């Protein structure tokens, strides 16, 4: 209510996850697709996902984590106070998402094969290249009955469910595995060890208008708090916040 949430990947792996998570969230944000603006927002995000998918196989590494989490969960059975009824549920959801992720076809393949999305991607690299005279097919597509568009869009988004499921569950688990430890950075500088951490979470004061500019280093790091307004904003000597290495 009065704190801002900042996250930072401590490794290239978590970096690809946070990105793929964001791009997928965007797809369903401005729905339904009614105007040209909305369409661009959609295909653009879809295109970004297809760009990161080419680089490497996100499937394997995401399965690896689903199992890693299954093991983290089972180490909590027996511990007095643990709601083991909730644990067995998660462990099954992980396995469910595991099979679903395996049985499904190559990630984003259905989107790559789509004729429409293919044409739109070509003109995203061009500043003003996604106009009507550049994308006639898209212009017609935006005049068809609203039901038809919702139909195709739903399908496009559905094809990522296997990825969306495993992804949202991995990150959700990691985010809650570690609590927020209160810290105090003086002079706008912080230095600590991350350890076996994949993610950093920071809750800064809404009124400080400051943001963490974290730098990496092996397993440790370095946070440099800077003001949104570099022309008018200040950085005090005392900065009490909340950190959490996940």
């Amino acid at each position: 209510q009065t704190q801002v949430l900042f996250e930072h990947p401590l490794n290239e792996k978590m970096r690809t996850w946070l990105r793929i998570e964001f791009l997928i969230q965007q797809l369903t944000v401005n729905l339904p697709i009614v105007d040209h603006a909305g369409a661009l927002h959609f295909f653009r995000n879809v295109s970004e996902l297809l760009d990161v998918f080419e680089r490497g196989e996100v499937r394997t590494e995401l399965l690896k984590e689903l199992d890693r989490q299954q093991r983290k969960l089972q180490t909590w059975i027996g511990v007095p106070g643990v709601d083991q009824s909730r644990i067995e549920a998660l462990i099954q959801q992980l396995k469910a998402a595991g099979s679903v992720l395996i049985s499904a076809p190559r990630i984003g393949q259905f989107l790559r094969e789509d004729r429409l999305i293919a044409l739109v991607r070509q003109r995203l690299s061009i500043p003003g290249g996604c106009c009507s005279f550049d994308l006639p097919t898209l212009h017609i597509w935006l005049h068809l009955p609203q039901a038809q568009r919702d139909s195709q869009v739903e399908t496009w988004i559905a094809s990522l469910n296997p990825l969306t499921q495993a992804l949202t569950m991995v990150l959700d688990l990691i985010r809650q595995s570690a609590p927020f430890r209160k810290q105090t950075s003086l002079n706008g500088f912080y230095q600590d060890n991350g350890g076996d951490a994949d993610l950093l979470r920071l809750n800064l004061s809404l009124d400080s208008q400051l943001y963490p500019q974290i730098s990496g280093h092996k397993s440790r790091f370095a946070i440099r708090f800077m003001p949104l307004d570099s022309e008018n904003g200040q950085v005090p000597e005392r900065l009490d916040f909340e950190l959490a290495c996940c």
């Binding site: 909590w76 511990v79 106070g81 809650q176 595995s177």
Partner: peptide, 12 residues
């Protein structure tokens, strides 16, 4: 020992 357990794994 009991607070060392993640809040989402912590209930009855």
């Amino acid at each position: 020992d009991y607070l060392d357990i993640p809040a989402f794994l912590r209930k009855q």
